[PDB]
Curated annotation (Swiss-Prot), chains A, B:
Phenotypic effect of disruption: Bacteriolysis during the stationary growth phase. Cells lacking this gene also accumulate UDP-MurNAc-tetrapeptide, an unusual compound that normally is not present at significant levels in E.coli cells.
MF-aspect GO terms: carboxypeptidase activity; muramoyltetrapeptide carboxypeptidase activity; peptidoglycan cross-bridge peptide endopeptidase activity; protein homodimerization activity; serine-type peptidase activity
Family, as annotated: Belongs to the peptidase S66 family.
A family per Pfam: Peptidase_S66C
Pathway(s) it belongs to: Cell wall biogenesis; peptidoglycan recycling
Keywords: Carboxypeptidase, Cell shape, Cell wall biogenesis/degradation, Cytoplasm, Hydrolase, Peptidoglycan synthesis, Protease, Serine protease
Purpose: Releases the terminal D-alanine residue from the cytoplasmic tetrapeptide recycling product L-Ala-gamma-D-Glu-meso-Dap-D-Ala. To a lesser extent, can also cleave D-Ala from murein derivatives containing the tetrapeptide, i.e. MurNAc-tetrapeptide, UDP-MurNAc-tetrapeptide, GlcNAc-MurNAc-tetrapeptide, and GlcNAc-anhMurNAc-tetrapeptide. Does not act on murein sacculi or cross-linked muropeptides. The tripeptides produced by the LcdA reaction can then be reused as peptidoglycan building blocks; LcdA is thereby involved in murein recycling. Is also essential for viability during stationary phase.
Gene Ontology CC annotation, any one: cytosol
Annotated InterPro entries: Carboxypeptidase_A_C_sf, Class_I_gatase-like, LdcA_N, Peptidase_S66_N, Peptidase_S66C, S66_fam
Keyword NADP (UniProt): no
Cellular localization per UniProt: Cytoplasm
Catalytic site: 108, 202, 272
Organism classification: Bacteria, Pseudomonadati, Pseudomonadota, Gammaproteobacteria, Enterobacterales
Protein name as annotated: Murein tetrapeptide carboxypeptidase
Amino acid sequence: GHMSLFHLIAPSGYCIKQHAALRGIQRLTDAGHQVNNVEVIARRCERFAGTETERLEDLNSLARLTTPNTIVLAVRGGYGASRLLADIDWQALVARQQHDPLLICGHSDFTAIQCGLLAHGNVITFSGPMLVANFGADELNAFTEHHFWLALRNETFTIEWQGEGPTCRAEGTLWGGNLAMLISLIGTPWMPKIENGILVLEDINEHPFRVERMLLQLYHAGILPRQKAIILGSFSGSTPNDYDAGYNLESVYAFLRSRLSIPLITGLDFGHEQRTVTLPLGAHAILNNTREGTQLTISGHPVLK
Amino acid sequence: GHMSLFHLIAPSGYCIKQHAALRGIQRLTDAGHQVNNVEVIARRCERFAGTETERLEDLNSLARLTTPNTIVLAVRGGYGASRLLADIDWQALVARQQHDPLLICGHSDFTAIQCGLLAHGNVITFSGPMLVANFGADELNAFTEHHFWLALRNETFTIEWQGEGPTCRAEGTLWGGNLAMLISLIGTPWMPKIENGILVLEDINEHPFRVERMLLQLYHAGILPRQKAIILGSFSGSTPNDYDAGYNLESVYAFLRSRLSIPLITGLDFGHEQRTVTLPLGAHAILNNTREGTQLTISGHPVLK
Ligand SMILES: [Mg+2]
Ligand SMILES: [Mg+2]
């Protein structure tokens, strides 16, 4: 059916949840997949998944990786990608992806690498599950599993959900990912300058006020109002404390909405929850929000042949 | 001696520590100071110190505030200044500060307003103590008290400390403040574009990896290497967790140092600890680090006559 090759990379934090990574590896292999580069799991340097040299070579070595239909799977997030950005051989990776592209998938910290690929070569990659959090969870979430294989196997596919926002249609380049990581790139060479897009954002363990602060920066930098639509994903561990006294994500949505002339849709399952979709960053998307529900139709990404 | 007028403003979070604000007011008044605009203490709207309208007018009303030698004192930080930035009458405030300037002092969230004043009119303001955290603490810290009145009363003054870094001399415009707030302005109209400066940074309850992430953005955006020197202040609530496995502020300093050709000095008491200096943002500074210690000589700011 869809037995595949996965190739691990670990540009970010040390894998503390050794149990969960080996559980993810075993689950993939029990399903008939094969996993290369399993040695990245053991690697450690302080809080990083190996030395600057080793994490860097995980990425730069992808230019020589030639097996057909290889899924490159980030192990986990944390911190560490930001240290690598200046030393990544962006041209060589962009060149590699022009023919028989690797199918590169991860989320969180990995956003920054995905962003730099976009900035340098419009190279499409997948914001979606990673080895430890998703494949290595106690149960593999079926929604996430479905949506991963849905994107990677179908040249055109549709996601749907009961989103909140105006009834609207919008079309443009799908981009975004982890909000904090996108913010961390403003002003740098790896910030994608995508206008007229569909920008999708999520985050984890950011209090609402921080989420607002970040969205407002994207607003004030002129990024939000240049898009066709904004979609908000999951904002995990973002419940009010006492001091908030009614201030919550709803307030954040209201505050940004009062400044935007373009639609903002919320409620997509995307980011760090056990339910996440897989979004090909740099692909084409058509957003349609009606009274019956929301759809996002995506095309242009590379798929398993 | 130096009995003065203070005028409160509250652009940020609701004052939950009512006890501490009234304690700060009482301490100032027991010393012979007078405090106006004491009604801002009661104000509340969700997590903010009043409605958008009310917090905004705290700032815009400063243009009509004409008493000689008025110290405008921010009550507290939190979140809220970012919501105001687009609606502040920057020109009117810049114009006000051209003659008989208000002496405006605060830290934390207030950084963003201080930044916008710099960006629009090179208007000097003071990164230093606020009503609740500093004047309203159980004891008024003598180091902080001394350094506050030191800056406000002396046209030229010198701070000294046992800083760590290369032996060096550097000269240029003093700028910076709260690191997270400075980051939140990158790409926006309120980011100061100060080259050849002395950039001083601090923060609170940011883990080291976040501190690094922010410093690296300032590095990758081209801001750090355009300065003459970088000074790091207090980084409060920034001790490692278990996962860090040796990763700490020292690592952060090392990592940035390996990328910078300009000196980076650490160890200044500046920011959120009970000991903080008061730095006039936009003033002229001469940094001198020798084997005996570090000095920073500052001039050009407005003072009490
Ligand atoms: Mg709107
Ligand atoms: Mg250096």
